[PDB]
Amino acid sequence: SDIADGQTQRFDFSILQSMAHDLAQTAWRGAPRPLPDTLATMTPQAYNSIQYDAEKSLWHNVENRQLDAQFFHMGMGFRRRVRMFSVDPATHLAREIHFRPELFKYNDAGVDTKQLEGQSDLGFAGFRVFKAPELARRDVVSFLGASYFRAVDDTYQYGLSARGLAIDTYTDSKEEFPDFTAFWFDTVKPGATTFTVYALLDSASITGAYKFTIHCEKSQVIMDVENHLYARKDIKQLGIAPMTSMFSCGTNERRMCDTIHPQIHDSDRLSMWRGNGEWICRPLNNPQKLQFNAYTDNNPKGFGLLQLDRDFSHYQDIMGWYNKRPSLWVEPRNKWGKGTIGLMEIPTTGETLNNIVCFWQPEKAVKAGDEFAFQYRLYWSAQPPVHCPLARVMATRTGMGGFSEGWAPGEHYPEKWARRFAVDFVGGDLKAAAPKGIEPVITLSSGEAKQIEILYIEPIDGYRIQFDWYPTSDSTDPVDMRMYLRCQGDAISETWLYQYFPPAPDKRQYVDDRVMSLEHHHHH
Amino acid sequence: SDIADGQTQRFDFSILQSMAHDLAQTAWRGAPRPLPDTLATMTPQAYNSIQYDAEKSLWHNVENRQLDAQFFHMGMGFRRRVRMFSVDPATHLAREIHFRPELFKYNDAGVDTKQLEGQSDLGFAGFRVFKAPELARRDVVSFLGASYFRAVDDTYQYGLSARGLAIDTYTDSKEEFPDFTAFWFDTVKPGATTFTVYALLDSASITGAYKFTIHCEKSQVIMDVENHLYARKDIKQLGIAPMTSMFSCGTNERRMCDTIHPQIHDSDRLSMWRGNGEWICRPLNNPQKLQFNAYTDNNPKGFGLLQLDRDFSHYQDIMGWYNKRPSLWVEPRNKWGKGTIGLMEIPTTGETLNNIVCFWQPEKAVKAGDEFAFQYRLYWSAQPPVHCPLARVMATRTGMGGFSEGWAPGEHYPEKWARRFAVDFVGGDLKAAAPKGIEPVITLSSGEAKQIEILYIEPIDGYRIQFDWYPTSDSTDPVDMRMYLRCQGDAISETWLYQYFPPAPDKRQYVDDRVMSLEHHHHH
Ligand SMILES: OC[C@H]1O[C@H](O[C@H]2O[C@H](CO)[C@@H](O)[C@H](O)[C@H]2O)[C@H](O)[C@@H](O)[C@@H]1O
């Protein structure tokens, strides 16, 4: 009856650490063996019409179950055979769920199932967990990819994603993508919306043992992650608790915004809570040139890629519902010590490319034989679980300056070239601080802040800081900008880090291409 | 006590039509005489520090006054001396209000009030009306300019303008700006929010007698307008009931949208209700080339420039509050017969130039001696007083096309060049009609409509019609597009008229200037 009917074996979190440790001592298993021909040469239509059998779900036998799970068929870009096991947490005894065609319904699929018959080694691509009131529709957790996984809050819309690990995302060499190659699921308890799933990570450079304790709460999904990592080789770049999102069109430097969509992004900013208590808002970019930024920290308290613009009218996407897509908050649960938060921002021209990658990278160079243990909570939800207790950046608007706000000239372009920055703040003591006097403190790597203005914005009960950036140089070098609000010498806001790309000096001017002629009269 | 203290003279609407018609028999009075030297050479500071004395207001002596009025001082571009009169409607007697310096507080004006002592013929630039509970501050109606005037709804935010008359706005010659040279004010009744103001129009080409019965309602201003017009010369273009708005950056053809404001406009569309009963929604353009359009009609039922996007977040303007600015509806009160609704859209690069002019222009060529009479109601309010009983366009969005919606390529631009149009409809019977089948009927001057899609939009309970436009020709000639929704042989929506400007053939392609280099790593 239960789908998991393989050889019984003892399993616990330490046996997996041993598996992973022992595995690190041998040669990497290498790239996956080709799939059976019937799957190797599949049209998307064909794959898509393969459907896991809902009545053979992982936990079909558990009464009052509030959670169930199904498996994705191997095929398409899923070339790694992920093995799946069921663990009775009472007896610490695991049984393998072997792939078999009986587990699936191949409908209008022209799949030669006969060549799948003895392929009990095929395993699956990954898995999804459903929660009540619907246990076979609208998954809330999905592990499917390499180390990749994602989840949803009460909107049920999937957005940014996370991975078990990142290796060499940005270096002299090509990036390496560790696979999760096996998952052990503790049988859910009747009534529970918490489930436990251990995973084995395997890769040319490194193995790991992972435990995921996953809480499908009413408003969000919380994941208690513990990992143990075993380097096989020297590693150039190790990325702990990595996130992957997309940013094409935002309120900032809008250079890829010729769609019907006012904004296009899965996430709009990096939030960092630093070990010293400082909060940072790093508005994400769609740079024309690939960028890596490393934010030095020690014992980071938290960091996330957030989607805080929840307004459909700002996106107009009735396919992907970007306004419903969630935020991801990484809460270190042990002291991670010295290192950097890496943000890679890749140039994109649409929404098909996850062009945003963020992770933690320990200070210390990774050498063959090094071992690591990280614990962290992930919160999949619209609003992060924590935010600055002070004035918070709500939005970072950028555009032409060189004029007076409200009086942008209609007949000529502006006299001088400048770039306008508008940073709206909403938050704590802004109201009580306002009479006492709010000074923005601005810091620029290059250029001069001019026409600094502080303006009340009734509709969001906040304050807008505008300044015009005037260049001092012919340099196209990135401009690292920094801003916070001050009041009687004390800071009253989070810090805003921005990365501006000044245009070429030949393009620091406007081309006025208008024509005012009696050539275009039309009668209807 | 009252400020009206010139010579008693009989006055009524007939007597003004006589002044106007008699005035037409003589030569135009010509361009205004130079102002006194102190006002000719004024800093905008100096002028702005002149304040009409609220204790000398027009209706200071009326008890239970729900309305009052004040005058604008002559100066700056106010060069025509407008004469102002008070009428007792009981006795049909009218006393002039002569300019006297004592009616104003000059403050830090730096003005030789002594060369303003004798000047009884100076008059004023214009007038404004205030309504309780603020009869000295938030104005609701303002006549100031030439034939120009404007009003506000319960937002109390000024936006687009009207005029008495438009002359030669688009022809071989330069435009002619008739001036309101005198106003007569029926004294307000106690308790009344209706007031009546008569106006004399005077211009090189034409004179006129205007009556404005102006209702300052709770939620809007309604103006009952009657004029009589007396042509002194042949006239190339006569524009009745004209409107003047602005449109810089909307959701359509976003060619001037590099501001911190997602949208900048005082109006977004030309709404027409034709003699035959057909409704038209013509979204306004900010074209790079000056356009005139003439929409043929017979006994037009109504027309207006509407500001239907009420959403602060779509504009982010806290100076001019575009979201609060009103719609203006012209409702002809008699059968105006054959002619054209004229729409001139001038190129702009900001908000300072009113680049939208719309008016009625009768079929018949205007010759000297001609007399005209129009009656129309003006509705200054957010929502026009009447709209299509069918489905209504809510927004016209344009952008890149040639890809599948929601899968815009990230690593390349689209293979082929096309322009995407997305018209959202939010009207009636769309829900009942969807099962029966909603056919979009598209008409194109040039090019072909491919990838035509009908998509339900939950958040506005509406339907989005998208099409890619592919060129058939190397021509840059404007493309008239026309769309309505049909179901079972019947039209179920208003007609959408759009005017598209294809780009030069050499620019019907995308330039891919991305770079993927290790050149830009940054440590903080
Ligand atoms: O399930 C989502 C995708 O996951 C995989 O893709 C990620 O992992 C790959 C490593 O095998 C990377 O090369 C890739 O760039 C990542 O997106 C999977 O292979 C894809 O086909 C899935 O869409």
Residue numbers in the entry:
A (entry chain A), B (entry chain B): 35 to 558
From the manuscript:
Most Gram-negative bacteria synthesize osmo-regulated periplasmic glucans (OPG) in the periplasm or extracellular space. In this study, structural and functional analyses of OpgG and OpgD from Escherichia coli revealed that these proteins are β-1,2-glucanases with remarkably different activity from each other, establishing a new glycoside hydrolase family, GH186. Furthermore, a reaction mechanism with an unprecedentedly long proton transfer pathway among glycoside hydrolase families is proposed for OpgD. The conformation of the region that forms the reaction pathway differs noticeably between OpgG and OpgD, which explains the observed low activity of OpgG.
The ligand-free structure of EcOpgD was determined at 2.95 Å resolution. The overall structure of the ligand-free EcOpgD resembles that of the ligand-free EcOpgG. The substrate binding site is formed as a cleft in the ligand-free structure, whereas this site forms a tunnel in the structure of the complex. The difference arises mainly from the closure motion of α-helix 3 to the substrate in the cleft.
